Amino acid sequence: ENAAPAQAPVSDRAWALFRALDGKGLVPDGYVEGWKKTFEEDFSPRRGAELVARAWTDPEFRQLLLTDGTAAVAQYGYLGPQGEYIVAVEDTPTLKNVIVCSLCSCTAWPILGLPPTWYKSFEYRARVVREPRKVLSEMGTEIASDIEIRVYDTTAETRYMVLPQRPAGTEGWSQEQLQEIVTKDCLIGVAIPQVPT
């Protein structure tokens, strides 16, 4: 009762799927290796951090990113699969934004990177929509009971990034300095950018 079906090792099953398709000439040469490279090297939260640091230092770009994210992202050349229609959402002193895909894992891949394991967990997918304050708290981010939390559930084609607030103690930093404190978690919305002492 309730017991798992017998299965071959997952690596064996994944390689079998590959070999069945590849042996029929259905997979171009280099095709999966190409995608692995794109996933590991091109799609990256460093891009989203670049965008944030630009927005922080260039009021005109910040405005473009917030009204037409897709256009803003296109200027850097960072549109791509699972990131063709982009909306950036702006934290303020009374609003903290957080992104999930409750139904699966949907994420703005090209500018956030592929989602990490935790984001795809049943725990995140179930809980953040109903108790985001507690979830963030458990993750190490306190949001005062005053600040509205707004969860974006990624249920269609819009692909989101959070524009976090710029923290105090960064005045006059270079775009490279600011990029360095905008992490993947800041773009997802679970972390606030941290300035060292």
């Binding site: 692995k36 996933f39 590991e40 999930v100 409750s102 139904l103 990177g113 592929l114 990490p116 394991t117 935790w118 967990s121 049943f122 725990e123 995140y124 997918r125 179930a126 809980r127 953040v128 929509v129 109903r130 979830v135 458990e138 993750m139 190490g140 981010t141 559930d153 992490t183 993947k184 978690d185 679970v190 972390a191 941290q194």
Partner: peptide, 23 residues
């Protein structure tokens, strides 16, 4: 369709912890 289900524990992450390689 998990949103709102109750009974799950902690999300297996704290902010900026190491998530390992993409794969």
């Amino acid at each position: 369709d998990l949103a709102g289900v109750q009974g799950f524990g902690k999300v297996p992450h704290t902010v900026n912890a190491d998530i390992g390689p993409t794969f």
